[PDB]
């Protein structure tokens, strides 16, 4: 039989979440969400079963000064996993070290904050000195700021980096908690801002999208699966299945 594929992933609502049950759940049955449905579809099309393993360090992946990676990206580089199926952003720096499938979703960075301030943009946020801001540590949003040559974003990176201990949060849940409980705005991918702001009416998006990019399935460079997964993703795209999956997991509007 085809070897069971190892899937690296990360907890991130509504992509990957713990299923609620009053009885024991084991293995893949512990998880549900958009990415689990995606795996069910992809595996049907490609003819494999899989083992879902949460990334040990709880990170998406960034490289340090030595050029060393962490998170799901490192799991792929080191061939610890066959596939990464998560809200994993397709980026230039990552594409040089892993293979991505074609995108299954598009999005852009924006700002999550509480309601009631005059901040209307990243420019406004960088200029003012009352509200702190940051991003999830060792994700693509952090990297966007680190690599930016746009002045506002260079300043925002210097600020985040100077206050890294508090400004760069461990994960999105910590970021949202910091937004809700302190004077802190989180730079966050838009599809997740859409999800949370329809669930917690104290939260809002500030400004528009700062960039535009996609999520893709990650594989190690040279993987024989990448092209097959790309073909399957295009099938799901064209058949309207990706759209249906988004509707299923984001439904539906809960706030004014
Ligand atoms: N998709 C990003 C991770 C992350 C970001 O760096 O913006 C953190 C996490 O934050 C909540 C939205 C989904 C995720 O995006 C990445 O692939 O590194």
CATH architecture of 1-107+213-256: 3-Layer(aba) Sandwich (3.40)
Quote the ligand 1 centre to 216 CA distance (angstroms). Answer: 12
Residue 72 near residue 10 (C-beta atoms within 8 A): yes
- Within 208-256, strands assigned E span 213-215, 218-220
- Closest ligand 1 atom to residue 60 Cα is 18
Q: How far apart are the first and last CA of the chain?
A: 52
Alpha helices in 68-139 (DSSP H): 71-77, 92-95, 122-127
Name the 3-class secondary structure at 226: helix
Which residues, 6+ apart, have CB-to-CB distance to 135 below 8 Å?
A: 141, 142, 145, 160, 167, 168, 169, 175, 186, 187, 188
The radius of gyration of the chain from alpha carbons, rounded to an integer in Å, stands at: 18
Resolution in A: 1.5
108-212: which CATH number, 3.40.50.720, 3.40.190.10, 3.90.550.10, 3.90.950.20?
A: 3.40.190.10
Burial class (CB in 10 A: 0-12, 13-18, 19+), 231: middle
- Closest ligand 1 atom to residue 143 Cα is 6
Q: Any known ligand binding at 224?
A: no
Quote the ligand 1 centre to 136 CA distance (angstroms). Answer: 7
Experimental method: X-ray
Q: b/e string for 187-197 if b means 16 or more Cβ within 10 A?
A: bbbbbbbbbbb
Which of 136, 173, 175 has the most ligand 1 atoms within 8 A of CB, as the residue to mutate? 136
Look at the block and give the residue holding tokens 């910091």: 178
Name the 3-class secondary structure at 235: helix
Q: Any known ligand binding at 89?
A: yes
Q: Is the beta carbon of 191 within 6 A of some atom in ligand 1?
A: no
Nearest to 110 by CA among 175, 173, 194: 194
DSSP string of 121-159, one letter each residue:
SHHHHHH-SSSEEE-BTTSHHHHHHHH--SHHHHHHHHH
Nearest to 60 by CA among 44, 76, 46: 76
What separation in angstroms does the CA of 206 have from each of 91, 101, 199, 210, 219? 24, 31, 16, 11, 34
Residue 236 near residue 41 (C-beta atoms within 8 A): yes
Domain borders along the chain are: 1-107+213-256, 108-212
């Amino acid at each position: 039989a085809n070897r069971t594929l190892i899937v690296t992933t990360i907890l991130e609502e509504p992509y990957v979440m713990y299923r609620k049950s009053d009885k024991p759940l084991y293995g893949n049955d512990r998880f549900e969400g958009y990415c689990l449905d995606l795996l069910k579809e992809l595996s049907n099309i490609l003819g494999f079963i899989y083992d879902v393993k949460l990334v040990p360090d709880g990170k998406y992946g960034a490289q340090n000064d030595k050029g060393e990676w962490n998170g799901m990206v490192k799991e792929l580089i080191d061939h610890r996993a066959d596939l990464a199926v998560a809200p994993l952003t397709i980026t230039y720096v990552r594409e040089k070290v892993i293979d991505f499938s074609k995108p299954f979703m598009t999005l852009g960075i924006s700002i999550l904050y509480r309601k009631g301030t005059p901040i209307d943009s990243a420019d406004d946020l960088a200029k003012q000195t009352k509200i702190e801001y940051g991003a999830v540590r060792d994700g693509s949003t952090m990297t966007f700021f680190k690599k930016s040559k746009i002045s506002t974003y260079e300043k925002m990176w210097a600020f985040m980096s100077s206050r890294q201990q508090t400004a760069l949060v461990r994960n999105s849940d910590e970021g949202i908690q910091r937004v809700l409980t302190t004077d802190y705005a989180l730079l966050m991918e838009s599809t997740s801002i859409e999800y949370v702001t329809q669930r917690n009416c104290n939260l809002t998006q500030i400004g528009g999208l700062i960039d535009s990019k996609g999520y893709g399935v990650g594989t190690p460079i040279g993987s024989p699966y990448r092209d097959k997964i790309t073909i399957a993703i295009l099938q799901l795209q064209e058949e309207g299945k990706l759209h249906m999956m988004k509707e299923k997991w984001w439904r539906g509007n809960g706030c004014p």
